[PDB]
């Protein structure tokens, strides 16, 4: 296909390497939310790259929302710099992308009920519950959400190649169920 | 409808602290000075 | 002259992406130097 | 909620009290007692007395939430009350639950 999955979301983690006083951070940093009674971590956002971080008192952090590996690492570097400037000796240890989400359009309708009937060992489809068919690919280990509209979502990737590979795998299968 | 609320609140507060001032042995004149200081600061 | 400030209580604060909606009540505002009051205030802002 | 103390109404009161404290006309304790009376009075008057609606739009510059208290800062805001416009370059909003 001249069809290329576009990355939509990446979740990464990194270890700042030092215990953090979350109350201090929530009171002094901008665009921060801290409600320990409901969630043990501070939720902070920045505009560039536009992302949301989850910062734990352990010093570990989760970065979400970026659309490229480089944006994910940059964003996390900024969060770490904010924490750094508030007075904590933050480091930047073991940065790692944990999940990547892609999406695309095959440009044609799909016979979902047909696909699930013939691919019972990889998918499940309950229209009343969720309008999308869930396909658990084994290689690569990626989960796809397939809609009758032809729109496709791919998630669970650790690297960009798995996203592209999973879509190349599913495309011919999907053509086999086009709607005519 | 705002100056009204303020008058309303100032009146209520002044009336409601009179006894406290009295129980403390503070001359009622001081209470009136409070109201005056307060109302004028609004202006 | 004035520090524009609003002191109130919130009913519901909502956000979708970078779209925030505020549902406020019992507020005293000082805008441009003047004083205002509201039983309810509804606002919209992009972050 | 000692929420409404840093308002025109509340601050003019505190300033007036500090003077009286300064000139030793009243004790700090008495001043505190007056502020306490003010809290009950302003809260009560707002809920039962005022009853109008306002609307505002602008760009959110910052937000913070800690101790169940929201603190925002909007830029280029437009406060709308039936009888029209109130424009401000910047406004800080503190809100208790």
| CATH number of the domain encompassing residue A40 | 3.30.310.10
Q: Are residues A89 and A110 in the same domain?
A: no
Element (H, E) at D46: helix D28-48
For the four alpha carbons of D66, D67, D68 and D73, in that order, the dihedral sign comes to: negative
Q: Is D19 helix (H, G, I), strand (E, B) or coil?
A: helix
- Write the CB contacts of D24 (distance below 8 Å, at least 6 apart in sequence): none
Q: Can you tell me the distance from the alpha carbon of C28 to that of C37, in angstroms, rounded to the nearest whole number?
A: 5
Q: Is chain A touching chain B, with at least 3 CB–CB pairs below 8 Å?
A: no
Last residue of a domain, one of A35, A64, A97: A97
Nearest CA to CA, how far is B34 from chain D (Å)?
6
Q: Are residues A88 and A17 in the same domain?
A: yes
Instruction: Determine if residue A99 is labeled as part of a ligand binding site.
Output: yes
R_g of chain C computed on alpha carbons = 12
Exposure string over A156-175, b if 16+ CB within 10 A, otherwise e: bbeebebbbbbbebbeeebe
Q: Are residues A141 and A156 in the same domain?
A: yes
Q: Are residues A110 and A143 in the same domain?
A: yes
- At what angle are helices B28-42 and D8-22 packed, to 10 degrees? 140
Q: Are residues A122 and A104 in the same domain?
A: yes
User: Can you read off the two tokens belonging to residue D49?
Assistant: 């007395």
CB contact under 8 A, D42 and B9: yes
Supply the range of the domain harboring residue A74.
12-97
- Give D-chain residues touching C37 at CB under 8 angstroms: 46, 50, 52
Exposure string over D14-35, b if 16+ CB within 10 A, otherwise e: bebbeebbeeebbeeebbebbb
Of the candidates A83, A81, A47, the residue with the CA atom closest to the CA atom of residue A65? A47
Q: Can you tell me the distance from the alpha carbon of B16 to that of A11, in angstroms, rounded to the nearest whole number?
A: 59
Contact A65, A7 (CB under 8 A): no
Instruction: Determine if residue C15 is labeled as part of a ligand binding site.
Output: yes
Of the candidates B18, B12, B10, B1, the residue with the CA atom closest to the CA atom of residue B42? B10
Q: Are residues A6 and A16 in the same domain?
A: no
Q: Are residues A90 and A107 in the same domain?
A: no
Q: Are residues A163 and A113 in the same domain?
A: yes
- Give A-chain residues touching D62 at CB under 8 angstroms: 30-31
- Give A-chain residues touching D63 at CB under 8 angstroms: 31, 33
Of the candidates D81, C18, D24, the residue with the CA atom closest to the CA atom of residue B2? D81
Burial class (CB in 10 A: 0-12, 13-18, 19+), B29: exposed
Q: Are residues A66 and A28 in the same domain?
A: yes
Nearest CA to CA, how far is D93 from chain A (Å)?
14
Q: Are residues A103 and A44 in the same domain?
A: no
Q: Can you tell me the distance from the alpha carbon of A94 to that of A18, in angstroms, rounded to the nearest whole number?
A: 13
- Report how many domains make up chain A: 2
Q: Can you tell me the distance from the alpha carbon of C28 to that of D10, in angstroms, rounded to the nearest whole number?
A: 10
Last residue of a domain, one of A82, A97, A112: A97
**Method of structure determination:** cryo-EM
φ, ψ of residue D22 in degrees (nearest 5) = -60, -50
Count of CB atoms situated within 10 Å of the CB of B19: 9
Q: Are residues A17 and A92 in the same domain?
A: yes
- In this complex, the residue of D46, D57, D81 whose CB is nearest that of residue C45 is D57
Contact C29, C38 (CB under 8 A): yes
Pairs from D43-49 (Cβ < 8 Å, separation ≥ 24): D43/C26, D43/D1, D43/D3, D43/D4, D45/B5, D45/B8, D45/B9, D45/B12, D46/C26, D46/C28, D46/C37, D46/C39, D46/D4, D47/C26, D47/C39, D49/B5, D49/B8
Q: Are residues A160 and A114 in the same domain?
A: yes
Last residue of a domain, one of A97, A119, A154: A97
Length of chain A: 180
């Amino acid at each position: 296909s001249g069809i290329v999955p576009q990355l939509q979301n990446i979740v990464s983690t990194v270890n700042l390497g030092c215990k953090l006083d979350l109350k201090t951070i929530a009171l002094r940093a901008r665009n921060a939310e801290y409600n320990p009674k409901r969630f043990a971590a501070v939720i902070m956002r920045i505009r560039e790259p536009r992302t949301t971080a989850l910062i734990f008192s352990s010093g570990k952090m989760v970065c979400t929302g970026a659309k490229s590996e480089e944006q994910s690492r940059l964003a996390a570097r900024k969060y770490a710099r904010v924490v750094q400037k508030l007075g904590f000796p933050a480091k930047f240890l073991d940065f790692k992308i944990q999940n990547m989400v892609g999406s695309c359009d095959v440009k044609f309708p799909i016979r979902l009920e047909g696909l699930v009937l013939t691919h019972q060992q990889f998918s499940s489809y309950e229209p009343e519950l969720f309008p999308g068919l869930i396909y658990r690919m084994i290689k690569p280990r990626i989960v796809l959400l397939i809609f009758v509209s032809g729109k496709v979502v791919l998630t669970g990737a650790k690297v960009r190649a798995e996203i592209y590979e999973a879509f190349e795998n599913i495309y011919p299968i999907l053509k086999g169920f086009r709607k005519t | 409808t705002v100056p009204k609320l303020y008058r309303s609140v100032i009146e209520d507060v002044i009336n409601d602290v009179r006894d406290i001032f009295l129980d403390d042995g503070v001359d009622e004149q001081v209470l009136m000075e409070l109201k005056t200081l307060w109302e004028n600061k609004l202006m | 002259d004035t520090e524009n400030v609003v002191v109130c209580q919130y009913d519901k604060i909502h956000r979708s992406k970078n779209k925030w909606k505020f549902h406020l009540k019992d507020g005293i505002m000082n805008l441009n130097g003047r004083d205002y009051i509201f039983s309810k205030a509804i606002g919209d802002a992009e972050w | 909620y000692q929420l409404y103390r840093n308002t025109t109404l509340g601050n003019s009161l505190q300033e007036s009290l500090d003077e009286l404290i300064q000139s030793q006309q009243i004790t700090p304790q008495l001043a505190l007692q007056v502020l306490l009376q003010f809290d009950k009075a302003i809260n009560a008057a707002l809920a039962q007395r005022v009853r109008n609606r306002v609307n505002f739009r602008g760009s959110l510059n910052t937000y913070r939430f800690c101790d169940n208290v929201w603190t925002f800062v909007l830029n280029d805001v437009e406060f709308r009350e039936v009888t029209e416009l109130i424009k401000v370059d910047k406004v800080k909003i503190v809100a208790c639950d």
